[PDB]
């Protein structure tokens, strides 16, 4: 009976409309990182053979679903295209100098991919305490892997955390500038990179993500409203 | 099939200079970005150098910047790496990796443990 | 060890693929052309059908 | 002086019809056709832009008639003149109310983005457009019927079409600018947000300067002065002429849409 | 010994190349020049299926030629009645990231999978009325790229890992495994008789597998990049592969080599999905520039274009009776063309 079919279609459309509100309200994030990066610790920070893990959390009554790939092969050119419509990519990097060049290459590939080109990236320069300890130790030299550091000097308008040794400031801002150079080398300003200095003991990473997603949503709305 | 044969590399004294060459066959060499990667004893695959389709843009890992020069020959479908002042750390197996797709600016998986567009590589040893 | 383990199976697969009976390309092309010719009328997409019995019109 | 003032009025009319009128006409038509052609993927702002384009197109079309004083003819006060007056009043109210509602919706989208997502729905946008048109129609008809059984009509015009709309526009865009500057100094993109602030300021200023003259002219009296009436009417029509330019042409999104439409065509 | 084994492999590969070259006495174009062209193929959008909140990653027609299932990355797969546009079912998924979906040839079940590495089998004929997960096949160590039913109890699934697997749905165990690929297996195509199936992976190669024995019968190369899609020719003696190198390629099982290549100079974008018309004379291929191209499979000249979509065309399927072509896209719309 065609009438029963149309009735069922109306029921299903009502269900779809009901769940569309849930889909639109929620903000989706993709957590990316390496083995050394403490992305798992970032996941466990948020106190509210599987191939992907989801974490639901809330900030200021807005809901975030953060997705971290689990059992996947290292080749990511194909399964990453699934995340071309997420709100943001939280990129976690082990900032303690070495795999920094590998992280930079990963960030460059993520930035310049044809499908992630419109997705902003939240960059967590994780493990800042280890970076400070090993910079103060002096055994390891950043210039060994990044010779440009031998000439780089912290900008005159820097904002070091009070009590921070200027050497640590120079190193951390040098790494941040290394990532920002790739960020700004392309993209024509439709997607942004938000660098943050994070640690394992930090408790405001959720706040950072919430603020950056607020800015991303503001940019999206400003673009759709023709103001940009 | 897509094939890359690294024709070069070998033993050398510290501070010497070699020239690695890779012949690429089975695909339009001009459309693809190319990269040199290396695996040192006991290490993972490490990205060394990158050259675009036209050779206009080039990039190096900081450890080899100023010592290695990457170059491309589309007519001969060849990729060269002129290595100068070789340090003992440079000892490794060098592979020539191809960008996964043509005309693209991303090179995701060139450094993966298993990659379908990477040559068997050539061993470079420094005395 | 493992490298030779993979190489031996690669060689085995190559021998298996090398011993298969192979036919000239002309025969395969003729077969495909004949199949397409036989079913030309039965394919609506390249032989449009009147809207009276098109399910979407 | 009468000859001099008449000549000055005609010179101003020539300047307007040469410079401003093509902007309004061509831009409103282009906005309408470009937004309608892409109906399958229209966003909430596009609905308000389309309705404002309709209103501005009607007003600018009437501008030419008003420019050469063709209205002082074929009165037919029983039908034609009253109908034209009501139609133009509803068009003016629709233009002003759509500007005000677009400002408020912009405030909602750029300040309450992550919390008021339920409020902003395309079906709700169409309902809002319908309610805006109904409100304009009612604001036009109610005073007309009340005085049928005029100073009161002009009073309602002035108040409900410049004072409340301008107050709402100013408040909403001040809040939007506050949000933009607060998010500008921390993590936002400096150049594009400076451009957005410039666009907001341009919109507010053009609306204010174009609609203040006629409203103040009406308020002062609440015949005579032909030149003053002519220039204030020219400014009022120039509001609709310039609305497409500031709202669509100066923005990158609509220019990209127009380029894509041209490439498709 | 490694060098010796590599040299032996090189010798065998040279032998295979020489045999293929010897068998290539003529090209397909040289023989298809004799037949007249298919003419302009202009297809209209008869239906637009709305209701998905995100990208449509996959779709599959039912064997009845009327009902079709489409999976979207919002966590929903919808079974539509194309004739009337009614949505018969809207199954919510445990994992939002679904990359494939299948419709059982009997119409009783559907299958889906994705980044969860699990193939969920849903029973549509449930007595309770509400579709519920009949089974969850686990065992793949990578994202599920494709899946196809052989019967109500057997299903073949290709994975992001380098292997495919034939499962027993009743027991939920991998009846057999197909290994040999070096990259992600992106596509999968059952033969008309279901005795063999071809899988294209993230390399130049596409492999033919015998479901009974469980080994690779043949490997076909020629593509320069990943093979995103694969489809079997209607007679089962050939198949077409679409790749990231922006070209389609028709291979023959018996000739064991490339037969034809479909490409154009201004096409510089990858191919996401391919399929054949009922007769096999037309090859429809979806592209990353979100417009499908209808190629003359025999003459290899672009015969038509389907340019209704606004975002990447991700899936494309021709009906079993050949009466329409359903194309999904990343704009969350499925369009029926005819
Ligand atoms: C509103 N203007 C013109 C009205 N014309 C419009 C009709 C409909 N819709 C419109 C929309 C717009 Cl935007 C602008 C104009 C109209 C008042 C000027 N009329 C006058 C002329 C001469 N002498 C006057 C003396 C006094 Cl005491 C008061 C008014 C006098």
């Amino acid at each position: 009976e065609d009438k029963a079919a149309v009735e069922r279609s109306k029921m299903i459309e009502k269900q779809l409309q009901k769940d569309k509100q849930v889909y639109r309200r929620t903000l989706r994030l993709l957590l990316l990182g390496a083995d050394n990066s403490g992305k798992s610790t970032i996941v466990k920070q948020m106190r509210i053979t599987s191939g992907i893990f989801e974490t639901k959390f809330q900030v200021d009554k807005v809901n975030f679903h953060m997705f971290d790939v689990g059992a996947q092969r290292d080749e990511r050119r194909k399964w990453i295209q699934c995340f071309n419509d997420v709100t943001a990519i939280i990129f976690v990097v082990d900032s303690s100098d070495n795999r920094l060049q590998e992280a930079l290459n990963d960030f460059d590939s993520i930035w310049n991919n044809r499908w992630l080109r419109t997705i902003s990236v939240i960059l967590f320069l994780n493990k800042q305490d280890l970076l400070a300890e090993k910079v103060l130790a002096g055994k390891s030299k950043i210039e060994d892997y990044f010779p440009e550091f031998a000439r780089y000097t912290t900008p005159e308008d820097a904002t070091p955390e009070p009590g921070e040794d200027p050497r640590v400031t120079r190193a951390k801002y040098f790494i941040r500038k290394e990532f920002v150079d790739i960020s700004t080398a392309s993209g024509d300003g439709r997607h942004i990179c938000y660098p943050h200095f994070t640690c394992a003991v930090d408790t405001e990473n959720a706040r950072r993500i919430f603020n950056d997603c607020k800015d991303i949503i503001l940019q999206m709305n400003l673009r759709e409203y023709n103001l940009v | 099939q897509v094939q890359l044969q690294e024709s070069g590399g070998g033993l050398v004294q510290p501070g010497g200079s070699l020239r690695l060459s890779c012949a690429a066959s089975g695909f339009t060499f001009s459309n693809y970005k190319m990269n040199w990667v290396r695996q040192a004893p006991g290490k993972g695959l490490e990205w060394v150098s990158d050259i675009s389709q036209s050779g206009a843009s080039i990039s190096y890992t900081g450890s080899v910047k100023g010592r290695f020069t990457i170059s491309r020959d589309n007519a001969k479908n060849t990729l060269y790496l002129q290595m100068n002042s070789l340090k003992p750390e440079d000892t490794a197996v060098y592979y020539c990796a191809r960008c996964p797709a043509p005309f693209t600016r991303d090179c995701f998986d060139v450094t993966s443990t298993t990659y379908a567009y990477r040559g068997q590589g050539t061993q470079v040893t420094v005395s | 060890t493992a490298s030779i383990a993979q190489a031996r199976k690669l060689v085995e697969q190559l021998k298996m693929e090398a011993n298969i009976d192979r036919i000239k390309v002309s025969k395969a092309a003729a077969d495909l052309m004949a199949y397409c010719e036989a079913h030309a009328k039965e394919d609506p997409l390249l032989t449009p059908v009147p809207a009276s019995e098109n399910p979407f019109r | 002086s009468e000859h001099q003032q008449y000549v000055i009025g005609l010179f101003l009319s020539c300047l307007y019809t040469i410079f401003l009128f093509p902007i309004g006409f061509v831009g409103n038509i282009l906005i309408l056709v470009v937004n309608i052609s892409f109906r399958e993927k229209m966003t909430i702002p596009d609905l308000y832009f389309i309705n404002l384009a309709v209103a501005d197109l009607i007003l600018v079309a009437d501008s030419l008639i008003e420019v050469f004083n063709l209205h002082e003819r074929y009165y037919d006060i029983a039908v034609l003149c009253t109908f034209m007056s009501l139609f133009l009043q509803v068009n003016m109210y629709s233009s002003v109310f759509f500007l005000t509602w677009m400002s408020f919706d912009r405030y909602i989208a750029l300040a309450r983005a992550m919390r008021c997502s339920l409020f902003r729905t395309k079906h709700h946008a169409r309902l809002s457009c319908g309610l805006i048109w109904m409100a304009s129609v009612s604001a036009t008809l109610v005073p007309f019927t009340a005085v049928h059984l005029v100073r009161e009509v002009q009073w309602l015009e002035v108040t409900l079409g410049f004072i409340v709309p301008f107050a709402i526009i100013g408040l909403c865009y001040s809040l939007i600018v506050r949000v933009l500057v607060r998010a500008h100094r921390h993590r936002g993109l400096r150049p594009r947000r400076q451009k957005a602030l410039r666009m907001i300021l341009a919109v507010v200023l053009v609306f204010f300067v174009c609609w203040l003259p006629e409203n103040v002219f009406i308020s002062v009296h609440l015949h005579a002065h032909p030149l003053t009436g002519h220039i204030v009417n020219l400014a009022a029509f120039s509001n609709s002429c310039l609305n497409p330019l500031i709202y669509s042409f100066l923005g990158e999104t609509f220019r990209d849409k127009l380029r894509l439409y041209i490439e498709q065509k | 010994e490694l060098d010796q084994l590599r040299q032996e492999a090189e010798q065998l590969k040279n032998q295979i190349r020489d045999a293929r070259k010897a068998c290539a006495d003529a090209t397909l174009s040289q023989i298809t020049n004799n037949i007249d062209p298919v003419g302009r193929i202009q297809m209209r959008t008869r239906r637009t299926l709305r209701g998905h909140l995100a990208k449509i990653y996959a779709m599959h027609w039912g064997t009845d030629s009327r009902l079709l299932v489409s999976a979207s990355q919002d966590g929903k797969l919808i079974i539509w009645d194309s004739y009337t546009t009614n949505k018969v079912h809207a199954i919510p998924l445990r994992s939002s990231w679904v990359m494939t979906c299948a419709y059982a040839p009997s119409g009783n079940y559907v299958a889906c999978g994705g980044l969860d590495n699990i193939c969920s089998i849903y029973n549509l004929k449930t007595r309770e009325g509400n579709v519920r997960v009949s089974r969850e096949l686990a065992g793949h160590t990578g994202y599920l790229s494709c899946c196809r039913f052989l019967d109500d109890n057997q299903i073949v699934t290709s994975s992001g890992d380098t292997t495919c697997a034939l499962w027993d749905i009743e027991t939920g165990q991998q009846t057999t495994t197909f290994t040999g690929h070096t990259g992600d297996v992106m596509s999968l195509s059952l033969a008309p008789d279901t005795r063999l199936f071809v899988s294209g992976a993230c390399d130049a190669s596409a492999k033919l597998w015998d479901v009974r024995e469980g080994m690779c019968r043949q490997t076909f190369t020629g593509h320069e990049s990943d093979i995103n899609a694969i489809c079997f020719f209607p007679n089962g003696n050939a198949f077409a592969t679409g790749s990231d190198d922006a070209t389609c390629r028709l291979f023959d099982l018996r000739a064991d080599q490339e037969l034809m290549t479909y490409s154009h100079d201004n096409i510089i974008c990858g191919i996401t999905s391919v399929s054949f018309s009922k007769s096999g004379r037309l090859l429809l291929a979806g592209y990353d520039d979100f417009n499908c191209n209808v190629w003359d499979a025999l003459k290899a000249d672009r015969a038509g274009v389907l340019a209704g979509h606004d975002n990447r065309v991700s899936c494309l399927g021709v009906t079993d009776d050949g009466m329409a072509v359903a194309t999904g896209s990343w704009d969350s719309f499925l369009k029926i063309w005819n």
Side-chain angles (χ1 to χ4, degrees), chain D residues 196-216:
Chain D
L197 287 170
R198 286 197 290 273
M199 265 173 104
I200 282 163
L201 193 273
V203 169
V204 173
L205 226 39
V206 76
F207 175 86
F208 176 79
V209 301
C210 287
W211 279 112
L212 186 74
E214 178 170 41
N215 283 274
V216 152

Side-chain angles (χ1 to χ4, degrees), chain D residues 3-217:
Chain D
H3 300 305
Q4 286 81 10
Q5 87 182 338
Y6 176 77
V7 165
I8 289 161
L10 295 171
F11 176 72
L12 292 174
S13 153
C14 187
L15 256 65
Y16 166 88
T17 186
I18 287 297
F19 300 114
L20 287 159
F21 184 99
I23 308 186
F25 201 68
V26 176
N28 284 300
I29 301 153
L30 260 61
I31 289 163
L32 255 182
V33 283
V34 170
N35 289 13
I36 273 284
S37 299
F38 294 26
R39 208 267 203 179
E40 58 265 46
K41 62 181 178 184
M42 266 171 44
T43 37
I44 285 166
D46 303 307
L47 281 297
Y48 306 133
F49 286 135
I50 271 163
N51 302 160
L52 185 63
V54 169
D56 283 332
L57 175 82
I58 293 165
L59 274 145
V60 72
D62 183 69
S63 184
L64 253 174
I65 291 70
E66 267 271 9
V67 151
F68 298 118
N69 314 85
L70 308 173
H71 56 270
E72 295 299 343
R73 197 179 182 180
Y74 52 82
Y75 301 98
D76 191 26
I77 187 60
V79 178
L80 189 275
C81 182
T82 278
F83 162 77
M84 211 201 337
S85 179
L86 286 196
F87 199 65
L88 299 169
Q89 291 282 359
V90 296
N91 300 137
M92 158 198 183
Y93 278 124
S94 280
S95 174
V96 169
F97 294 158
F98 270 113
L99 294 168
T100 309
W101 184 251
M102 203 186 301
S103 81
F104 173 68
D105 191 282
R106 277 174 168 186
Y107 165 77
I108 287 293
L110 308 176
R112 314 296 192 83
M114 309 218 293
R115 298 300 304 278
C116 288
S117 53
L118 295 132
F119 185 104
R120 287 192 79 240
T121 326
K122 218 179 299 187
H123 151 275
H124 273 91
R126 288 162 174 142
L127 176 90
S128 305
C129 300
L131 184 137
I132 290 287
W133 278 107
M134 242 78 81
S136 67
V137 168
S138 325
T140 320
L141 267 55
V142 167
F144 162 72
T145 43
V147 306
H148 197 283
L149 307 136
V150 175
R151 289 199 302 141
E152 162 54 19
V153 178
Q154 293 171 73
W155 249 93
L156 186 60
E157 286 173 50
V158 162
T159 53
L160 193 97
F162 181 69
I163 282 163
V164 168
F166 179 57
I168 293 161
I169 284 166
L171 179 62
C172 292
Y173 276 123
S174 307
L175 295 168
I176 290 162
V177 165
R178 184 182 170 203
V179 158
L180 278 174
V181 299
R182 276 203 286 186
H184 173 125
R185 299 174 178 283
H186 310 337
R187 65 198 82 236
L189 192 56
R190 188 142 292 172
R192 271 171 160 73
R193 292 204 172 169
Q194 293 279 39
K195 184 185 193 301
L197 287 170
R198 286 197 290 273
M199 265 173 104
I200 282 163
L201 193 273
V203 169
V204 173
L205 226 39
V206 76
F207 175 86
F208 176 79
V209 301
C210 287
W211 279 112
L212 186 74
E214 178 170 41
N215 283 274
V216 152
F217 173 64

Side-chain angles (χ1 to χ4, degrees), chain B residues 59-72:
Chain B
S59 300
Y60 303 86
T61 197
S63 62
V64 314
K65 181 119 66 194
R67 304 194 298 114
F68 296 1
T69 325
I70 192 175
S71 65
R72 171 201 275 273

